[PDB]
Design a protein around this ligand. Sequence first.
Ligand code: ZN
Ligand code: ZN
Ligand code: ZN
Ligand code: ZN
Ligand code: ZN
Ligand code: ZN
Ligand code: ZN
Ligand code: ZN
Ligand code: ZN
Ligand code: ZN
Length: 281
Amino acid sequence: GSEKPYKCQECGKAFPSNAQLSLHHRVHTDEKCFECKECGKAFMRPSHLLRHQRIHTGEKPHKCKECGKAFRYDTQLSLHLLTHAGARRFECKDCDKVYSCASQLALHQMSHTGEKPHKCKECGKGFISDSHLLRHQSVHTGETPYKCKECGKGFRRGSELARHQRAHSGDKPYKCKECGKSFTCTTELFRHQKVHTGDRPHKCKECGKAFIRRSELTHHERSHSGEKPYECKECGKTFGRGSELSRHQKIHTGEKPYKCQQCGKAFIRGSHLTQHQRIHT
DNA sequence: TGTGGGCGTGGCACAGGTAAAAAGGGCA
DNA sequence: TGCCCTTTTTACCTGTGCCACGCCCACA
Ligand SMILES: [Zn+2]
Ligand SMILES: [Zn+2]
Ligand SMILES: [Zn+2]
Ligand SMILES: [Zn+2]
Ligand SMILES: [Zn+2]
Ligand SMILES: [Zn+2]
Ligand SMILES: [Zn+2]
Ligand SMILES: [Zn+2]
Ligand SMILES: [Zn+2]
Ligand SMILES: [Zn+2]
């Protein structure tokens, strides 16, 4: 198992990213270097290190002079003061947001103009940044550096290994306020909550009924068209969705999966066993 | 009574956009 | 060494493909 896969071939310290490792390996390469206490990262100025340490210490020295709210970073206080009057404001020409200086207004407005300079060598797609392109390389690489300490299962993101380990331990800390069913991660709870909202953004143009997912709209449209693109290799049957084919194929394998006490009848589905449980109640 | 497909949603490993943190640095 | 920013990396967020259940109804 490895929640931090990027290990130093010089000291063995563990880091969750190549970038973080890269800025630790200053300790052993750079002559003029400044290392942090517990996290073991290095910086090329005391200014920088001391700034970084406020992450551990929780100090917030940059204090607003008229409302008094402290902040961790000059970055942050600078954005805050846009809220009071008498601040140099960089309003977005298009949307409604506002930025403290010009370099970040420019970076935002890359989201309108669609500029994506770092072009992927393989699919030719583009990204707002080098580290994003690095992220997208998961698609061509199929690597899984994050590894479960219980089963050694592989994951592309430490996020996902986290949710998996929560699954192992049965830790579902996201509860649906209305229903009560819990969830290992935040996306699962989000898609569920869509059932209470009635947030069904995909609408059948023909019929009118609305769905949660794009795939359901597809399967509905084909269920009006009659197109069943999923064929059995053995018996030649048709299906609209792959799950119905996969569940079908268990008829071809001898299964006899479930059974009932004192008569032993075998049913391919679990719910069938209930229907037969009604017989002798 | 027994089958079995259509339908709707849960589990899960996952990509990609953007808001936010975090690092980089010229210079007084 | 902090100002005053620029630039890079990460968190937060929202959507998605594939697979499998349980439910409802049509028939056999
Ligand atoms: Zn090292
Ligand atoms: Zn640190
Ligand atoms: Zn204020
Ligand atoms: Zn805008
Ligand atoms: Zn690519
Ligand atoms: Zn595991
Ligand atoms: Zn609920
Ligand atoms: Zn329809
Ligand atoms: Zn078949
Ligand atoms: Zn029985």
